[PDB]
Amino acid sequence: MPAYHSSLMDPDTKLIGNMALLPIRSQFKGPAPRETKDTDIVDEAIYYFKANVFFKNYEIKNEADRTLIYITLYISECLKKLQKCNSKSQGEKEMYTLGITNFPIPGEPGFPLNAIYAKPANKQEDEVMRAYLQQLRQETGLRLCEKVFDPQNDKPSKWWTCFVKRQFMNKSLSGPGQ
Amino acid sequence: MAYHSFLVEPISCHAWNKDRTQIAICPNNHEVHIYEKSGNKWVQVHELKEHNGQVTGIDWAPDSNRIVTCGTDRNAYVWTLKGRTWKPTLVILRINRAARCVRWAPNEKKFAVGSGSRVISICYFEQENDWWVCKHIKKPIRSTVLSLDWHPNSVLLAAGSCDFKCRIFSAYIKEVEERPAPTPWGSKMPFGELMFESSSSCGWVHGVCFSANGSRVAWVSHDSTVCLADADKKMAVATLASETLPLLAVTFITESSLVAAGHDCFPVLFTYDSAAGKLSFGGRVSQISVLSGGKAKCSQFCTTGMDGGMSIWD
Amino acid sequence: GRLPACVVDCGTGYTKLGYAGNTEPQFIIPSCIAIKESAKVGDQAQRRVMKGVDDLDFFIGDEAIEKPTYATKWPIRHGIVEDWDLMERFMEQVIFKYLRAEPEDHYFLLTEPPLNTPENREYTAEIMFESFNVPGLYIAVQAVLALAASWTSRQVGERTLTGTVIDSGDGVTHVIPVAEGYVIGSCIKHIPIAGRDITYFIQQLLRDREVGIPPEQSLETAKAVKERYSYVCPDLVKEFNKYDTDGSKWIKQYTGINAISKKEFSIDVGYERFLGPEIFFHPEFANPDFTQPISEVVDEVIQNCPIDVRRPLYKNIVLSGGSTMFRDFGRRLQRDLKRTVDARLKLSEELSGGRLKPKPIDVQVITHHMQRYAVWFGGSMLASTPEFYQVCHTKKDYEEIGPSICRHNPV
Amino acid sequence: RFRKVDVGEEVDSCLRQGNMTAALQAALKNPPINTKSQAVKDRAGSIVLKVLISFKANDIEKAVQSLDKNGVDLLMKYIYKGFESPSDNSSAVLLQWHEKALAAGGVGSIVRVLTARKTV
Amino acid sequence: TATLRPYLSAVRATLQAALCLENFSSQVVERHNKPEVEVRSSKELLLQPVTISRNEKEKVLIEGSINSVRVSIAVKQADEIEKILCHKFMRFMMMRAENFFILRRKPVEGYDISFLITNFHTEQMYKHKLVDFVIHFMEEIDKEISEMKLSVNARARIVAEEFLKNF
Amino acid sequence: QDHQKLCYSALILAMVFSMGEAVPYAHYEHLGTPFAQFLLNIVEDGLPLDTTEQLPDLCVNLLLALNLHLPAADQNVIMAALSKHANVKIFSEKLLLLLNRGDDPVRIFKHEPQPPHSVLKFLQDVFGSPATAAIFYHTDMMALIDITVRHIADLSPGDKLRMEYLSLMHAIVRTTPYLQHRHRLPDLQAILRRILNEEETSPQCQMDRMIVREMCKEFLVLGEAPS
Amino acid sequence: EVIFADLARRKDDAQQRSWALYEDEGVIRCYLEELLHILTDADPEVCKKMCKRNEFESVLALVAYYQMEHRASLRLLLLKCFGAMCSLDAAIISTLVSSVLPVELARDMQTDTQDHQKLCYSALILAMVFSMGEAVPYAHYEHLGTPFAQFLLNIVEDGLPLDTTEQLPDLCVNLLLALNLHLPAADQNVIMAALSKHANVKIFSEKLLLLLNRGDDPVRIFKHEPQ
Amino acid sequence: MILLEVNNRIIEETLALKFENAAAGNKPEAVEVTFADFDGVLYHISNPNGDKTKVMVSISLKFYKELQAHGADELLKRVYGSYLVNPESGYNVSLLYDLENLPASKDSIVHQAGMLKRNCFASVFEKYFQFQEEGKEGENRAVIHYRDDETMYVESKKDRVTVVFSTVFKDDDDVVIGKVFMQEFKEGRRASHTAPQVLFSHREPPLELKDTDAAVGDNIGYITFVLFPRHTNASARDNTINLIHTFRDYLHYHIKCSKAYIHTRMRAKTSDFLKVLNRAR
Ligand SMILES: Nc1ncnc2c1ncn2[C@@H]1O[C@H](COP(=O)(O)OP(=O)(O)O)[C@@H](O)[C@H]1O
Numbered sequence A: 001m002p003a004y005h006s007s008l009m010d011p012d013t014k015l016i017g018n019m020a021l022l023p024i025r026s027q028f029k030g031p032a033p034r035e036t037k038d039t040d041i042v043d044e045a046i047y048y049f050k051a052n053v054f055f056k057n058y059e060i061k062n063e064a065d066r067t068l069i070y071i072t073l074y075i076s077e078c079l080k081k082l083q084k085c086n087s088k089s090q091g092e093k094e095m096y097t098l099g100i101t102n103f104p105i106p107g108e109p110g111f112p113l114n115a116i117y118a119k120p121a122n123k124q125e126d127e128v129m130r131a132y133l134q135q136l137r138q139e140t141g142l143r144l145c146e147k148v149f150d151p152q153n154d155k156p157s158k159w160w161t162c163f164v165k166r167q168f169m170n171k172s173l174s175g176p177g178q
Numbered sequence B: 001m002a003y004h005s006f007l008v009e010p011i012s013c014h015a016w017n018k019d020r021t022q023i024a025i026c027p028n029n030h031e032v033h034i035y036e037k038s039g040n041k042w043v044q045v046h047e048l049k050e051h052n053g054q055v056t057g058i059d060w061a062p063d064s065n066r067i068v069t070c071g072t073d074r075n076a077y078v079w080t081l082k083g084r085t086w087k088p089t090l091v092i093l094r095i096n097r098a099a100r101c102v103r104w105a106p107n108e109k110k111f112a113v114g115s116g117s118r119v120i121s122i123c124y125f126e127q128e129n130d131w132w133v134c135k136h137i138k139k140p141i142r143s144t145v146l147s148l149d150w151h152p153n154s155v156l157l158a159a160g161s162c163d164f165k166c167r168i169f170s171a172y173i174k175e176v177e178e179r180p181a182p183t184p185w186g187s188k189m190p191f192g193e194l195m196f197e198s199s200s201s202c203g204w205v206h207g208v209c210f211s212a213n214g215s216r217v218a219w220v221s222h223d224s225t226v227c228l229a230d231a232d233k234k235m236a237v238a239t240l241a242s243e244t245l246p247l248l249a250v251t252f253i254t255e256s257s258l259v260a261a262g263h264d265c266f267p268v269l270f271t272y273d274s275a276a277g278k279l280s281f282g283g284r285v286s287q288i289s290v291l292s293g294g295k296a297k298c299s300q301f302c303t304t305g306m307d308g309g310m311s312i313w314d
Numbered sequence C: 001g002r003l004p005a006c007v008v009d010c011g012t013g014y015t016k017l018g019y020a021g022n023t024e025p026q027f028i029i030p031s032c033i034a035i036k037e038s039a040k041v042g043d044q045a046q047r048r049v050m051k052g053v054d055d056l057d058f059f060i061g062d063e064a065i066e067k068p069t070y071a072t073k074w075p076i077r078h079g080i081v082e083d084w085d086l087m088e089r090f091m092e093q094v095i096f097k098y099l100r101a102e103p104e105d106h107y108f109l110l111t112e113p114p115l116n117t118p119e120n121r122e123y124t125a126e127i128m129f130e131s132f133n134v135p136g137l138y139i140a141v142q143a144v145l146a147l148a149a150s151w152t153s154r155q156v157g158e159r160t161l162t163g164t165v166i167d168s169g170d171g172v173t174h175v176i177p178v179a180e181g182y183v184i185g186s187c188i189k190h191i192p193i194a195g196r197d198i199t200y201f202i203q204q205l206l207r208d209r210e211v212g213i214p215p216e217q218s219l220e221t222a223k224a225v226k227e228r229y230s231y232v233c234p235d236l237v238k239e240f241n242k243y244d245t246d247g248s249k250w251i252k253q254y255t256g257i258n259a260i261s262k263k264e265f266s267i268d269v270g271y272e273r274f275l276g277p278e279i280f281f282h283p284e285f286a287n288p289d290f291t292q293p294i295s296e297v298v299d300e301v302i303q304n305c306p307i308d309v310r311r312p313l314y315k316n317i318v319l320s321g322g323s324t325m326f327r328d329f330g331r332r333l334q335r336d337l338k339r340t341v342d343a344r345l346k347l348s349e350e351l352s353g354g355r356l357k358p359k360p361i362d363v364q365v366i367t368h369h370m371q372r373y374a375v376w377f378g379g380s381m382l383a384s385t386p387e388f389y390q391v392c393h394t395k396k397d398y399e400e401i402g403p404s405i406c407r408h409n410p411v
Numbered sequence D: 001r002f003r004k005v006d007v008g009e010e011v012d013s014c015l016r017q018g019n020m021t022a023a024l025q026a027a028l029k030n031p032p033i034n035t036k037s038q039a040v041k042d043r044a045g046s047i048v049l050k051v052l053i054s055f056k057a058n059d060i061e062k063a064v065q066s067l068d069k070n071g072v073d074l075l076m077k078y079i080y081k082g083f084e085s086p087s088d089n090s091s092a093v094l095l096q097w098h099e100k101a102l103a104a105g106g107v108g109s110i111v112r113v114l115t116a117r118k119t120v
Numbered sequence E: 001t002a003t004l005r006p007y008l009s010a011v012r013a014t015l016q017a018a019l020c021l022e023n024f025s026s027q028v029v030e031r032h033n034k035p036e037v038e039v040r041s042s043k044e045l046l047l048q049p050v051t052i053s054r055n056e057k058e059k060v061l062i063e064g065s066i067n068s069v070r071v072s073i074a075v076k077q078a079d080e081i082e083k084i085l086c087h088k089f090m091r092f093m094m095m096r097a098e099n100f101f102i103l104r105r106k107p108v109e110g111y112d113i114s115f116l117i118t119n120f121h122t123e124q125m126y127k128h129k130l131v132d133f134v135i136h137f138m139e140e141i142d143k144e145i146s147e148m149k150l151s152v153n154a155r156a157r158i159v160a161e162e163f164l165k166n167f
Numbered sequence F: 001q002d003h004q005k006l007c008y009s010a011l012i013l014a015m016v017f018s019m020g021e022a023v024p025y026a027h028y029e030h031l032g033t034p035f036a037q038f039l040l041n042i043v044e045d046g047l048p049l050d051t052t053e054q055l056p057d058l059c060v061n062l063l064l065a066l067n068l069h070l071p072a073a074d075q076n077v078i079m080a081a082l083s084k085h086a087n088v089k090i091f092s093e094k095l096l097l098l099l100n101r102g103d104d105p106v107r108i109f110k111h112e113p114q115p116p117h118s119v120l121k122f123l124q125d126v127f128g129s130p131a132t133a134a135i136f137y138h139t140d141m142m143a144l145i146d147i148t149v150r151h152i153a154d155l156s157p158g159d160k161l162r163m164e165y166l167s168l169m170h171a172i173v174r175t176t177p178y179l180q181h182r183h184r185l186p187d188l189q190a191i192l193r194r195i196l197n198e199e200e201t202s203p204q205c206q207m208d209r210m211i212v213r214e215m216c217k218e219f220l221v222l223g224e225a226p227s
Numbered sequence G: 001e002v003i004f005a006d007l008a009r010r011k012d013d014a015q016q017r018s019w020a021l022y023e024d025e026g027v028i029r030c031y032l033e034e035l036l037h038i039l040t041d042a043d044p045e046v047c048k049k050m051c052k053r054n055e056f057e058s059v060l061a062l063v064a065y066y067q068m069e070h071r072a073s074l075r076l077l078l079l080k081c082f083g084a085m086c087s088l089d090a091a092i093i094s095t096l097v098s099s100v101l102p103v104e105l106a107r108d109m110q111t112d113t114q115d116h117q118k119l120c121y122s123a124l125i126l127a128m129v130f131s132m133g134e135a136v137p138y139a140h141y142e143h144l145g146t147p148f149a150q151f152l153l154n155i156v157e158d159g160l161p162l163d164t165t166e167q168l169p170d171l172c173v174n175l176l177l178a179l180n181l182h183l184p185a186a187d188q189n190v191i192m193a194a195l196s197k198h199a200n201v202k203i204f205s206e207k208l209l210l211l212l213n214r215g216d217d218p219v220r221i222f223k224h225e226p227q
Numbered sequence H: 001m002i003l004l005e006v007n008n009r010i011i012e013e014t015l016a017l018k019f020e021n022a023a024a025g026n027k028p029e030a031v032e033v034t035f036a037d038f039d040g041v042l043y044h045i046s047n048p049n050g051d052k053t054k055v056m057v058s059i060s061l062k063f064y065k066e067l068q069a070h071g072a073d074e075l076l077k078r079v080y081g082s083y084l085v086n087p088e089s090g091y092n093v094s095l096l097y098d099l100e101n102l103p104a105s106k107d108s109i110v111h112q113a114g115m116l117k118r119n120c121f122a123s124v125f126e127k128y129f130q131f132q133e134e135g136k137e138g139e140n141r142a143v144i145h146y147r148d149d150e151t152m153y154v155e156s157k158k159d160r161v162t163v164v165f166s167t168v169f170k171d172d173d174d175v176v177i178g179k180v181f182m183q184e185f186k187e188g189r190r191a192s193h194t195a196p197q198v199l200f201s202h203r204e205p206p207l208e209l210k211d212t213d214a215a216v217g218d219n220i221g222y223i224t225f226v227l228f229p230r231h232t233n234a235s236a237r238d239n240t241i242n243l244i245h246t247f248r249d250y251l252h253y254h255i256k257c258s259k260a261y262i263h264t265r266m267r268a269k270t271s272d273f274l275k276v277l278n279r280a281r
């Protein structure tokens, strides 16, 4: 029950799509605008991550949770790659190489939660989903690079690598297969 | 002969469509399933779910094309094919204990349900309130009724009691029939008149059947006897003692020959001598029904057993 | 009688032996038996079945934790006895070796875990009367004894005879309310979280992160860090932020000794410290199918109890069994209950327009030094009394009735 | 309280005549079956088990075969009576009659013993 | 006195005639379904109980009904030590009457063990293999008893040497 | 020291002898008593090799088989071996377990001309002499009579083994002080009563009746009335 | 579909695997003996699909179970299974390298040097999975780093006093060649540190020549696609 | 356990802890513990007058005085000597140790403490063993009512000391099993020749005792050990005393555990039958 559900869904925020489109703070480009406060949905998924993955049950309390559960899965996919990185510099570029990969968009088959996400009905949502979900990934990767690699030796830090074995309710963004 | 298994567990009772192209069987549960002859194999087509307990009797009214089912649920329902769905109908059975057996009468206007309540309930349709209403044959019954068979007159009802005795009653419902035609079992017949009663005193009676000429009944008894009783004689019974296990089901197959099945799990055959009244055994689980030709001259029959499945014969 | 009665308390982690009237258990030993082993001489022809006198070559307790040439077995699981062959061999050596008691001349008090099935009460009685010819047995409810241990220890001005006891030993946690000396049997709840599953969670959590732990000793080190370093934290996600930012110092080091090579090994101890004890507050971390925090299970108990006793029960919650010893475990449960109870009263204020303010419920959670053996010490103070000798079943009653004299239970 | 108080409820002359098969054919003439009597049922058995024990094994085959179907069914009811309180060795003989009787009567002759509502 | 093979054959045939069960919803309770041999509330659903006996000690009672049959056995207790071994043998077996699905949790008074076979078992399990089990039980039980007697001698014979040798 | 070789050695040797034909009188220079004494110690204490507890059964089987072709009570080098031994606790025990089940371990192969049942043969020799009769502990002696009197009354007439068990009882009454303690006597008398009266024709039964008569006329305590 | 279930159920038998009770070993062996056969008697197209069936959960079960079970008698069978499974498909290799199995083998080999029979397979399996030279999680260099390499350089020079077959020197050469294959450049190389850090480089330094003149290499025994 | 260890384990463990902790120099803490033993000899460990620095141990033998007639005090004066003190009131004999004066290693001292039962019984046996060397046999039978129901008799016959236990088997199930065990003991002389000879009587006291009007009943056994000089001499006596004085409970202990052995095999043979029925499914 008391898993950390998404905090940011102030009704004044635009709510495009089957998920909270949210103002991803980044120097990348996309449909979502720029948040100015110090807290943001990618920072929220990062912040709550270590707790969230232990909770074996999780409701959708509001539309922003169907965002947060996807950000969490991609964060796990970051660790599934950065753990191999030989140094932080590789940990950045070999993360960008992940962000621009053709992840199954929730309405596409092979996405793990097709029961929970409605299909995007038209190009002006589908193409928005392609341009939003990349903007999530492109940013989400660059934030983990700064804090998975502890600064003494550009080792991928052990404490983070512990979580490599753990998956949010045992769902995988590899889908039925990569 | 041929064999097929519908299920692992007992097929407690079966019925057939008019043209035999479908069967109804109960998969040892609170339902009845209907199968169609889609090739050699059987395909399930419909599923009647409404009962709240194990069903124990079915009959599928040939011309009316409507199914009656009863069971431990006490409820009985007559099912109308209301388009592509069988819909049930209430029967105000007053019985306070489990129902055990059901058969339609040849005119398909009435049916009767046996039960552990020590009664037979005869039923007919009220048009004004959409339910079937009952009258009880009740007086000399003193134990559960195990099997029913209807005389060709649709009035006389032979009934196998778990009372070591086989009885014939006139189920004459005056609301449904003119006063019945005279019959060798006796001209005097109001509702519930006791037409006949077996001489013996031992062994439960599992099955009874009327020949296609109503003058001969035969019944089949847990003391490993088959008896036949003749109304062209003065109701004279004759009994064959046999070295088989108990027999559970019987039906005529000609006017003077008879067929039974039981815990030996194989069919057996009897003949009736019109002169001496002696039966004889010809030899070879839980029901027999003639498929083609009726009791006048059987040419196929079907048997279903607790061991599962049905067999068809020659 | 002259000779004192034996009190034998058997749990799934430990068993606790001694004669009644002593102030303290005379043996605390692990609930383990090390049976003899073979190089597949036991097989499909016959499994673990002995001949001659080969069955008597075994040991129990600490004499069985460290013998090399024997297979360690643990007969009691979730408090319930699972393999009575091993349990009967265990009981024999308790009596004829550890206790030195002659069973034919001492009364036995022996403990029921409040979950157990009546068949197990038949079989345990069949042992003592028909295998050992005990003159009389009594089967005691573990929780009521734990309350009596508090009662005799605590100050006479507050010997309330009323309270809820939380008995998180190993196996399963019981939450049980007693009002003025009567168990309210309808309200008893069982929580599956217990010392074993906290150990197992820590064991997995280490084995994923900290490989280098030798497989023979993973369990020992998991127990050590649980006992020595673990604590209930103030806010789950706020610890993870503190452990990230101050990872120089909240992280700790444990040094173990290799049992085989006698080389030392070291592990970094970290998130293990506050995960674990928080499994009581987030049971879904360890079980697929339990989810109410212990701080909300205990509320449901009191709220099912008769309306008059509810407030007193909040005034006196007693903590029993070893797992309840965790640092701050009392502080947090009291905070969660207090935050629940006074918010419930905030509703009934508004449904009456603030026209009257209810006398707020104070909640108390009480820790006391008996916690490691309060069940036995309660048992000893019971079995001392002359009353106890008449509550027991005399052996003749086992003759006239069957073993069925132990079918009954107060639940 | 309330729920406690339940509511809702001549042979010897044939034996010593040598053709002792004629005695057994005569022993079946005295069935007490229809009667309500109970001391007679204790007499009926004793008059037959005395006969059963007399046969040589050279004859016990024909002594069954010479019975009619009622005779075998009649005999089986006497067999299952001696088993209820054996003599010191007579079970050795009843089990030998049983072998023959069951060969002639088949298990059907047992079933109308199990279902026999009135008995010798 | 009576030899084994004729006595066992008689018990088999009788039991084969009694195992002719059918399902039967009870008359005296609204729709309970229960084994008539146990509840005995109806008294025209009962078959005549028959005993087969090898001698005065060894016998079998066969007791049937339209929906259930009970079989109870007594075995030759050939000496005092064998009484104790036999009784405890039954108890540890009977203690698994939920796995020996045909076995009653208590014997009948004056009988050593007793099986209750319901119509559900004869519908769900192969009849001729249940009867083979009951026969096999009698073929073995006095071998299984004697083997414990041989071992109980051996245990004591070791215990004596283990004590005396250390003098 | 080679456990596996030793195991196969005993097994194959028993297989070789299992058919029961007489060796020329020369093999006994080895396979006589000096070998039999060695086998007994392998059963009674064994070797540190045998952590599988497997040598005992192999050597017990060998001793039975090796007895299967020996003519008579004094020439029998194997019965001499028991007589001179110190004490045969374990061998005494193991042998009765075989008689209880009734099987014969030596018939490992199934060739047609079946020899005498090896254990019933083995015991009939053991009781051939009062010196070798003493080997059994007293509690086993009681169990032996209970085991043999179970068998004699279980078999049908005409069964091949009944003419063996009758011979074993006759030996037990002869050379062992059975009539002192009468362990099963008021039962055995009732058994001999009926087999003596049993009216069957086959040679097996004719042979049975002769020994039963001899069993009585040799000791009038048997065949007299129970009392 | 049965055997993978009955193993994956004993994994996360949280009670039994840490606080044992039943005679589990004698049945678990029967599954692994059967699995080892079917992993080679079946059509590889079946067993490949059963390994990759559900994001390799079948593999991760056995890999977890190897870490979980301390009995040496079973571990040999799990290693033999990993042997066959490594052969089926390079994709399975790409799982195992990235997984815990190498690191437990690294610790077992350094600690349990007495278990010579298992130690031979321990070397062999570690050499098989590394044969493809994919990148390895950086956490692994905490064991498979330089200390484990020096530990290998000991064995190839000195053998073992317990080494009856003296095979391990060769398998350690294969293992050294295998671990080396993925290492980037020549600066950071954990093995090249070890070689530079001892003067104990004689027999190894020569043995590499006998491969070089042989012209082949022992790695890539499977010849999967990107050789 | 096949044999029963003679040291009282609780006494060893309590004293070992106290003396280790004290020699380590920790300030002492109280002990207040009472515990039973076979034959209903009841111990108490206590701090005398509350001196945490002093430890006392006491025996409470129900049958002390009748044993004391055979000189038990002059045995205790030997093996404990300066560690004896006045009887702790209520108990027959008391032993006192100072946590201030523990010597450099304690093991034999704590082991002697553990045998404080056996050391009482040794005084009656060491007597009659020795009289056999003196060749006397005119001295009367010793009698120890070591329980209420049970009595041990000792006679020095010229060659043979004979000890004759009278014991009561509390159940029909026990006496039938006991009749087997003692029968094997009678034959034990075959298995291991040097052992003392054993005799058994199913109910009646043996004739040599009958002038004493020894108890009779269906549950009473009489068991005689005939100790030859090879068992009673000055070299062996300590080993013989450790054994014979336990014998009663050794016999019962195995009668009890013989049941557990049977119960195990009955579960195995049950599992055999179950696999046969399972073929019916
Ligand atoms: N310092 C400690 N902190 C937390 N838990 C502890 C500590 N010491 C012991 N424990 C727990 O106490 C348990 C001791 O057994 P306990 O639970 O008291 O008896 P039972 O076996 O009857 O449940 C240990 O298994 C362990 O789980």
Ligand SMILES: [Mg+2]
Pocket (backbone or CB within 6 Å): C011, C012, C169, C170, C321
């Ligand atoms: Mg506990």
